[PDB]
Design a protein around this ligand. Structure first.
Ligand SMILES: Nc1ncnc2c1ncn2[C@@H]1O[C@H](CSCC[C@H](N)C(=O)O)[C@@H](O)[C@H]1O
Ligand SMILES: [Zn+2]
Lengths: 75, 175, 95, 106, 96, 366, 82
């Protein structure tokens, strides 16, 4: 599908996530796309917890949704 | 007074800093002192001998390495075009000939030591050494520097640009 | 050659560049053996240990010399004298 | 899992904490003490070794002999203030001749 | 006879030297002298900090006391550089 | 460019100086002197503009209008007056039941000023008709609440003194969003204040758990009524535990600056990486009052104890700027010489981001 | 405050008497300034260590016992204050 990853500065990024693609692979694709390490990112959907070692289908997030990529620190 | 034309029109000046105030161990490893502890002992002010000069607010005694002179080092073929451009732009004889084969031009690139003067009663003499295989000119003093005087070295020209310094021994010429 | 005082400067500079020890091994070792025998008998020394002491000595000793040097300069002369050594030893605060 | 990489330093931190714990300097220590000590030792070692390398490349020799360390420690002034009463094995002494003892003639 | 295992600050300072000047070799004698120097400064600072902690009726050794010790012991602007570097290291360590 | 690396002296036209703030890009300094007067100094020009005899009791805060024609002052004697920038007299005068903490002007609505009364809900006073509109709050109405606009002032954010943050509209007052701060591990925490920026809609929050946190003004209306706290970086000082008094945002939108109380430790970080980059070396003995960078150029200027200390980037152009064809550099390579040796009748007439905080119209050359 | 005065607070007879307790007679008139200088450079370190010690203890007054503690840190010990 396609979802939005909203950052802190205010830029909006649109990415494609498959129904059967784990979150770790999505983070790896993001890291190879724009260089932000997975340790510097985590998913938040409308102020709700999302982890890295899981899959989108386990959370059942609707399409065209925005995810609060609340910034992190290296390591 | 906007109705009488005063004289001394042509100037041909480049370093527009002329003011009326002028309110002033082994060999190889001494390179550090050239670039770090060599920017306070000398100020730039209006010379009394001729034009601009390097006045002093500090003191340096005999046998003390002070400054390395660097500039656009070129061969002797460029001397012809360089002198033609000196005549055109109104450029002084900055043909600093370290030897007859290489000359240190100082009209397109040069260091702060472009501000020096000449007189038959100078304060320092020239010297050159070789560090790391490269020949570099560093000056060692023979006396102490007082506060408020200008560096000047004898050009050692064997006996028309006059040398107007006012000294009694001043030969009034580069000779 | 001639002109005494010229060769001294050359020797002192040559040795200032160098960084070797200055005391023959065997005489100093035997002296340390004797001064140890003064305290206790039949002490086996480590060859590394002796060397150790050796270096420290020169360090101490050379410092003393330098001090005496400037003391002679304070007395309007070049040659150093025994009296200057007692001067340095007393003024250092180690008598 | 390691602990030195948590701050990005190079000197070990677990070793420092163990050695300070068995060093009976006190009975109970905090968490920032070992990392802080590792950091300050890092800074001092870097400060000394940079001058060591500069002196090594002075004489164009790859290996750093202790003479280079002696020169680098002595020529600096803050080190001489901090390394006051300390010598160096095989260190030697920096060249020095008194000013008034310099003969000359015409 | 029976081989023994000894600890020296050999690998870490070597890594530091490579990180700074990855073109210059080091000698074993220099290795030992650097080991002695680091042991010396470590013991000096630790002992001074400990006796200060005893002086204040405190049974603990915090991180603050060590920076007080390095303010006292280290002279000049080197003290400021070292204390700033230590604060940087601890701040970068905690949130990890 | 990068963070300021040089140090500047003081700027004391008069001995006392309590508060300071830049207008839009650091034009004039609004000094609220501790004598009941309002002094205006000149920034980037090192001068003074106007002295206003406001009242007897001194003031404690200052801000200017969106159109730059007013000088609002959170008085210590409840004088909510609209002093004129031009003439210096009072245009509008009003009294509030509670004093004011943070005065601001919406860059799109100068009619409704920003007021932060204590033990009462924030009140917007309309300058067109002198009418007070109370901001609807939740739960208690006697808490130490601070109210502040967003980047554009289109939404207003309020912080209470139990752990609750409220989101509503600057003009419609439709309170439809709340937020509960994290309760540590066992004990809850109140909020001291929040502080915004001019780009990115980020905002720092200062709480009573000794830790400064950061949020963004976009995750509360997106989550809805109330969600789970999730800051980016829980920055703090873990070697001295200095409390936090006043801290503002960067002049570029990527840095974060935090101020001490008496320790002279001015900390800085960047939003991308929460790693310390530099620390300020301040001379101990004074209490910091206000900090606010140049909203465009990296520089730091902190007021304290009647004086001001500036750490800056002092710059003078190089001597080699005489002409583009004239340079004064040094090289040891041989000179690389050159290798390549209309008519119209038209007269000449032609002569962070930007917001609306302009038109001070205050300058007296004589 | 920083004032050039009170530096000459040790007027000439005090140094005279101190020299007498030292056991000297002929002192040149240009000794006083360098005596002031050496006294100031000495006092700098002790007062600095004392203020650091009192600051670390979270109080803004200085006692005598911390002063002798700093003095012992340098190496010169005092007896008679605890
Ligand atoms: N006193 C003097 N009178 C006339 N020419 C001088 C001079 N001293 C040096 N020169 C010439 O000027 C050339 C350097 S340019 C002079 C330095 C610089 N422009 C200044 O204002 O001082 C040299 O080649 C030298 O020959
Ligand atoms: Zn002359």
């Amino acid at each position: 599908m396609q979802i939005f990853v909203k950052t802190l500065t205010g830029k909006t990024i649109t990415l494609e996530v498959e129904p059967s693609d784990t979150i770790e692979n999505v983070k790896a694709k993001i890291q190879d796309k724009e260089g932000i390490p997975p340790d510097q990112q985590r998913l938040i959907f409308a102020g709700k917890q999302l982890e890295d070692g899981r899959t989108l289908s386990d959370y059942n997030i609707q399409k065209e949704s925005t995810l609060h990529l609340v910034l992190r620190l290296r390591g | 007074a906007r109705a009488e034309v005063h004289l001394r029109k042509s100037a041909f000046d480049m370093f527009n800093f002329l003011a009326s105030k002028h309110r002033q161990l082994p060999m190889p490893m001494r390179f550090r002192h050239l670039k770090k502890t060599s920017k306070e002992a000398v100020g730039v002010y209006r010379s009394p001998i001729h034009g601009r000069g390097l006045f002093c607010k500090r003191n340096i005694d005999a046998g003390e390495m002070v400054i390395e002179y660097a500039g656009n080092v070129i061969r002797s073929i460029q001397t012809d075009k360089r002198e033609k451009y000196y005549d055109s732009k109104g450029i002084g004889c900055y043909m600093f000939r370290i030897d007859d084969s290489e000359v240190v031009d100082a009209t397109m690139h040069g260091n702060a030591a472009r501000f020096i003067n000449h007189s038959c009663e100078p304060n320092c003499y020239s010297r050159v050494i070789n560090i790391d295989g490269q020949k570099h000119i560093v000056i060692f003093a023979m006396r102490k520097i007082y506060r408020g005087e200008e560096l000047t070295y004898d050009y050692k020209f064997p006996i028309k640009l006059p040398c107007n310094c006012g000294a009694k021994k001043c030969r009034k010429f580069l000779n | 050659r001639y002109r005494p005082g010229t060769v001294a400067l050359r020797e002192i500079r040559r040795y200032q560049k160098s960084t070797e020890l200055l005391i023959r091994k065997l005489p100093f070792q035997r002296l340390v053996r004797e001064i140890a025998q003064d305290f206790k008998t039949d002490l086996r020394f480590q060859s590394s240990a002796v060397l150790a002491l050796q270096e420290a000595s020169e360090a101490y000793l050379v410092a003393l010399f330098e001090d005496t040097n400037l003391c002679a300069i304070h007395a309007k002369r070049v040659t150093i004298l025994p009296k200057d050594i007692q001067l340095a030893r007393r003024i250092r605060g180690e008598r | 899992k390691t602990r030195s990489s948590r701050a990005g330093l190079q000197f070990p931190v677990g070793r420092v904490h163990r050695l300070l714990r068995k060093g009976n300097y006190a009975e109970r220590v905090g968490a920032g003490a070992p990392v802080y000590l590792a950091a300050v030792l890092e800074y001092l070692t870097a400060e000394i070794l940079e001058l060591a390398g500069n002196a090594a490349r002075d004489n164009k020799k790859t290996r750093i002999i202790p003479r280079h360390l002696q020169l680098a420690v002595r020529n600096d002034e803050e080190l001489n203030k901090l390394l006051g009463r300390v010598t160096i094995a095989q260190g030697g002494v920096l060249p020095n001749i008194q000013s008034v003892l310099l003969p000359k003639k015409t | 006879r029976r081989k023994t295992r000894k600890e020296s600050y050999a690998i870490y300072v070597y890594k530091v030297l490579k990180q700074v000047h990855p073109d210059t070799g080091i000698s074993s004698k220099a290795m030992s002298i650097m080991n002695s120097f680091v042991n010396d400064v470590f013991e000096r600072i630790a002992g001074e900090a400990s006796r200060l902690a005893h002086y204040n009726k405190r049974s603990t050794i915090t991180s603050r006391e060590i920076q007080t010790a390095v303010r006292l012991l280290l002279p000049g602007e080197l003290a400021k550089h070292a204390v700033s570097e230590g604060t940087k290291a601890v701040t970068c360590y905690t949130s990890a | 460019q990068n963070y300021p690396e040089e140090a500047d002296g003081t700027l004391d036209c008069i001995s006392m100086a309590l508060t300071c703030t830049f207008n839009r890009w650091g034009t004039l300094l609004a000094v609220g002197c501790n004598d009941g007067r309002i002094v205006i100094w000149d920034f980037l020009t090192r001068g003074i503009a106007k002295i206003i005899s406001a009242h007897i009791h001194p003031v404690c805060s200052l801000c200017w209008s969106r159109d730059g024609h007013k000088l609002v002052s959170a008085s210590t004697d409840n004088i909510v007056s609209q002093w004129d920038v031009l003439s210096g007299d009072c245009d509008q005068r009003f009294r509030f039941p509670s004093p004011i903490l943070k005065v601001q002007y919406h860059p799109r609505d100068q009619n409704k000023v920003l007021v932060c009364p204590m033990k009462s809900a924030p009140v917007m006073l309309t300058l067109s008709d002198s009418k007070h509109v109370v901001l609807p709050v939740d739960d208690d109405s006697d808490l130490n609440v601070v109210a502040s606009f967003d980047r554009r002032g289109e939404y207003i954010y309020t912080g209470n003194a139990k752990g609750k943050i409220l989101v509503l509209k600057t003009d419609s007052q439709d309170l439809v969003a709340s937020f509960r701060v994290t309760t540590g591990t066992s004990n809850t925490t109140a909020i001291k204040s929040i502080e915004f920026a001019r780009k990115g809609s980020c905002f720092l929050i200062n709480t009573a758990d000794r830790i400064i946190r950061v949020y963004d003004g976009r995750e509360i209306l997106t989550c809805g009524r109330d969600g789970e706290p999730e800051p980016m970086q829980k920055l703090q000082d873990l070697v001295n535990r200095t409390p936090w008094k006043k801290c503002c945002f960067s002049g570029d939108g990527e840095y974060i600056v935090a101020g001490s109380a008496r320790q002279h430790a001015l900390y800085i970080w960047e939003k991308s990486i929460g790693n310390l980059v530099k620390i300020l070396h301040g001379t101990r003995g004074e209490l910091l009052l206000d900090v606010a960078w140049h909203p465009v150029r990296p520089i730091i200027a902190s007021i304290s104890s009647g004086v001001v200390s500036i750490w800056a980037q002092n710059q003078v152009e190089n001597w080699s700027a005489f002409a583009p064809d004239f340079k004064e550099l040094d090289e040891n390579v041989e000179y690389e010489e050159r290798e390549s040796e209309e008519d119209e009748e038209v007269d000449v007439t032609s002569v962070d981001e930007e917001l609306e905080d302009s038109k001070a119209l205050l300058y007296l050359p004589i | 405050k920083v004032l050039r005065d009170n530096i000459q607070g040790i007027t000439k007879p005090a140094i005279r008497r101190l020299a007498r307790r030292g056991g000297v007679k002929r002192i040149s008139g240009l000794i006083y300034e360098e005596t002031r200088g050496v006294l100031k450079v000495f006092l700098e370190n002790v007062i600095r260590d004392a203020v650091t010690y009192t600051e670390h203890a979270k109080r803004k007054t200085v006692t005598a016992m911390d002063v002798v503690y700093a003095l012992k840190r340098q190496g010169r010990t005092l007896y008679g204050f605890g």
